[PDB]
Design an enzyme around this catalytic site. Structure first.
Site, PDB file in Angstrom:
ATOM      1  N   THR A   1     -25.489 -25.616 -48.122  1.00  0.00           N
ATOM      2  CA  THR A   1     -25.160 -26.646 -47.114  1.00  0.00           C
ATOM      3  C   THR A   1     -24.816 -25.919 -45.817  1.00  0.00           C
ATOM      4  OG1 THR A   1     -24.690 -28.220 -48.843  1.00  0.00           O
ATOM      5  CG2 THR A   1     -23.289 -28.449 -46.845  1.00  0.00           C
ATOM      6  N   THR A   2     -25.071 -26.564 -44.697  1.00  0.00           N
ATOM      7  CA  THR A   2     -24.547 -26.163 -43.431  1.00  0.00           C
ATOM      8  C   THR A   2     -24.016 -27.402 -42.745  1.00  0.00           C
ATOM      9  OG1 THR A   2     -26.228 -24.402 -43.322  1.00  0.00           O
ATOM     10  CG2 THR A   2     -25.347 -25.240 -41.248  1.00  0.00           C
TER      11      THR A   2
ATOM     12  N   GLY B   1     -23.970 -22.165 -45.403  1.00  0.00           N
ATOM     13  CA  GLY B   1     -24.715 -21.712 -44.242  1.00  0.00           C
ATOM     14  C   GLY B   1     -23.802 -21.363 -43.088  1.00  0.00           C
TER      15      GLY B   1
END
Lengths: 228, 227
Positions: free
Chosen positions: A1-2, A131
């Site tokens: 995930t970011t 991320g």
């Protein structure tokens, strides 16, 4: 995930990639990690999706009750504290990293980071998810205070894209939402219009010379492309 | 006339007499006045002294419930006190759970709810006090009264207790759009000195508190050099 959130004068922007993964295989390529908590408060979810869906739902339930009692829109700090407490009481049983951000008339745009372990920190921007570790330097080098809404949306889209081009665990769409005294503005950018990827970046077009032909010189030139 | 022994019972007319009687305690207690001003709220109560040998600060009717809020108990004092502890738990709750000083309207709502519940169970009795709530949180200056029924109402100015029908007549001559906290401390003290009955209660002192912009929105007894 970011995930990430950024303050600007008058509001915030929240941004996220769209990928949910089992490690190696993508089970959902179009998740929505920007979750609504009240009309102008959202959170960005990272970690276990099961946990952060359950805590966001619970935080939203509490805030709607509180707004009916008080009869007033709720401040960001309230959202952040309710969530924080849920994240702290359950710290050993969950995997969650949260960003709460929002607009309210008393304190304007605000951003809280609530990382694993359940601390709660009030910032001008916050990064989260796997991320995130690719964006610290990005932001240190390229981020500025004073950005308008439009500069900040664009900057967030470009940060997410930098992150997800190098992070195996991020990818897909880029969703954003901008929260301010006016109406919420959401945007989704498809991977085919991403502002950055390594596939389209000209310094990665020509291939490394790992496979030179059998030659009578130590000079290296090109990869062998056809059988001899 | 068995209908007036528990508060879990309507009478045939739709009245709840246990609650009427508790209201009678309040109406025979000492007189308190309050005023909601431009810059804050002021409360004043009259303490009837039972003895010339009390230390000053005995049987205080005004208590702080939060940095920005306070209550003046009129009626039976120890009943009033149980209401003060709940009000503080509520105020604490709001800071702990929701990160906000409690709004004045919300604190008054919660006090009412609390007084209401002792009006519905055979095992308890109504409280024998009314509680004036004075606040100055993000919603601005507010003055509420809760009573033994659990009814809650907001006010510009008010008076409870035995003097209350005259005091109300004098509070009507004020002007609530102009008046400040400084002027009110003077005028409310004059009204308590005039409605005071000298035949019946020989020993009294006045208590007076406030939450204003002067006091940096902190509820507090006014400094004793201003009466």
């Amino acid at each position: 995930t970011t995930i990430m959130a950024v303050a600007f004068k008058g509001g915030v922007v929240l941004a996220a990639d769209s990928r949910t993964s089992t490690g190696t295989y993508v089970v959902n390529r179009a998740s929505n990690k920007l979750t609504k908590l009240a009309e102008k408060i959202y959170c960005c979810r990272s970690g276990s999706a099961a946990d952060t869906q359950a805590l966001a739902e619970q935080t939203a339930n509490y805030l709607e009750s509180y707004e009916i009692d008080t009869s007033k829109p709720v401040n960001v700090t309230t959202a952040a504290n309710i969530f924080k407490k849920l994240c702290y009481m359950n710290k050993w049983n969950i995997s969650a990293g949260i960003i709460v951000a929002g607009y309210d008339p008393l304190n304007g745009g605000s951003v809280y980071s609530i990382p694993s372990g359940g601390s709660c920190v009030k910032l001008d921007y916050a990064l989260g998810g796997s991320g995130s570790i690719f964006l610290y330097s990005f932001f240190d080098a390229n981020y500025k205070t004073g950005m308008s809404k439009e500069e900040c949306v664009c900057f967030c889209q470009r940060a997410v894209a930098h992150a997800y081009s190098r992070d195996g665990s991020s990818g897909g769409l880029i969703r954003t939402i901008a929260l301010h005294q006016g109406e919420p503005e959401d945007m989704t950018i498809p991977w085919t219009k991403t502002p950055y990827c390594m596939e389209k970046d000209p310094k990665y077009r020509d291939l490394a010379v790992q496979n030179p032909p059998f030659s009578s010189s130590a000079k290296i030139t090109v990869n062998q492309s056809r059988s001899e | 006339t068995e209908h007036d022994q528990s508060t879990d019972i309507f009478s045939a007319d739709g009245r709840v007499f246990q609650v009427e009687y508790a209201c009678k305690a309040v109406d025979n207690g000492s007189t308190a006045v309050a005023a909601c001003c431009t810059d804050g709220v002021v409360v004043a109560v009259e303490k009837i002294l039972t003895s010339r040998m009390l230390e000053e600060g005995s049987n205080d009717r005004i208590h702080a419930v939060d940095r920005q809020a306070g209550v003046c108990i009129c009626g039976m004092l120890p009943d009033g006190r149980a209401v003060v502890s709940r009000a503080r738990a509520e105020a604490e709750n709001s800071r702990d759970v929701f990160a906000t000083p409690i709004p004045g309207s919300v604190l008054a709502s919660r006090i009412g709810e609390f007084m209401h519940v002792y009006t519905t169970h055979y095992a308890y009795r109504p409280f024998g006090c009314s509680v004036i709530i004075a606040s100055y949180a993000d919603d601005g200056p507010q003055l509420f009264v809760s009573d033994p029924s659990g009814t809650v109402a907001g006010y510009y100015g008010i008076a409870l207790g035995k003097g209350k029908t005259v005091a109300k007549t004098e509070l009507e001559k004020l002007n609530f759009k102009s008046i400040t906290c400084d002027e009110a401390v003077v005028k409310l003290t004059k009204i308590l000195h005039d409605v005071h009955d000298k035949s019946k209660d020989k020993l009294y002192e006045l208590e007076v508190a406030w939450v204003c912009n002067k006091s940096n929105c902190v509820f507090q007894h006014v400094p004793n050099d201003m009466i």
